[PDB]
Paper text:
Nsp1 plays a major role in the shutdown of host-cell mRNA translation, the promotion of viral RNA translation and the suppression of the cellular immune response.
Initial attempts to generate a crystal system suitable for CFS using an Nsp1NTD expression construct consisting of amino acids 13–127 produced crystals that diffracted to lower than 2.5 Å resolution (data not shown), making them unsuitable for a large screening campaign.
Residue numbers in the entry: 11 to 76, 79 to 125
Amino acid sequence: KTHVQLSLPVLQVRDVLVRGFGDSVEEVLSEARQHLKDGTCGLVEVEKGVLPQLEQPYVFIKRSDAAPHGHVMVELVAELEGIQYGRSGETLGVLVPHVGEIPVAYRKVLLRK
C-alpha cells in the first residue's frame, strides 16, 4: 500500500535513549522508514530546547494534506545543518528509535510509504 496507518508513541525528549537514526540524511530516512515498518519508532514533539537535545540529521514527520479515520497524512523530511531534504507541511514532531520508553500520548498518522 502507498500509505499505512500507524499510531506513534509520543516520548518526552529527556527520556529518549537513542537520540537519532544515524549519521547521514540517506541513512536516517532509511532507518526511520524501517523503524516505522517494524513498530519501533517514537515521536518527540518539537518545542524550544528539543532539537538541540537530539542528534542530527533529524527526521521530521510533516503534514502532507489537509485525515482519514483520524490519521493525519504525513511524509518524512530530513534536516542536516539547516538544509531540509524533502518539501512538506507543518511538523508534527521529530522521529526517534523507540526502545521501550514510556509514552505520554499516541499520534495517529497515515504515513506515505
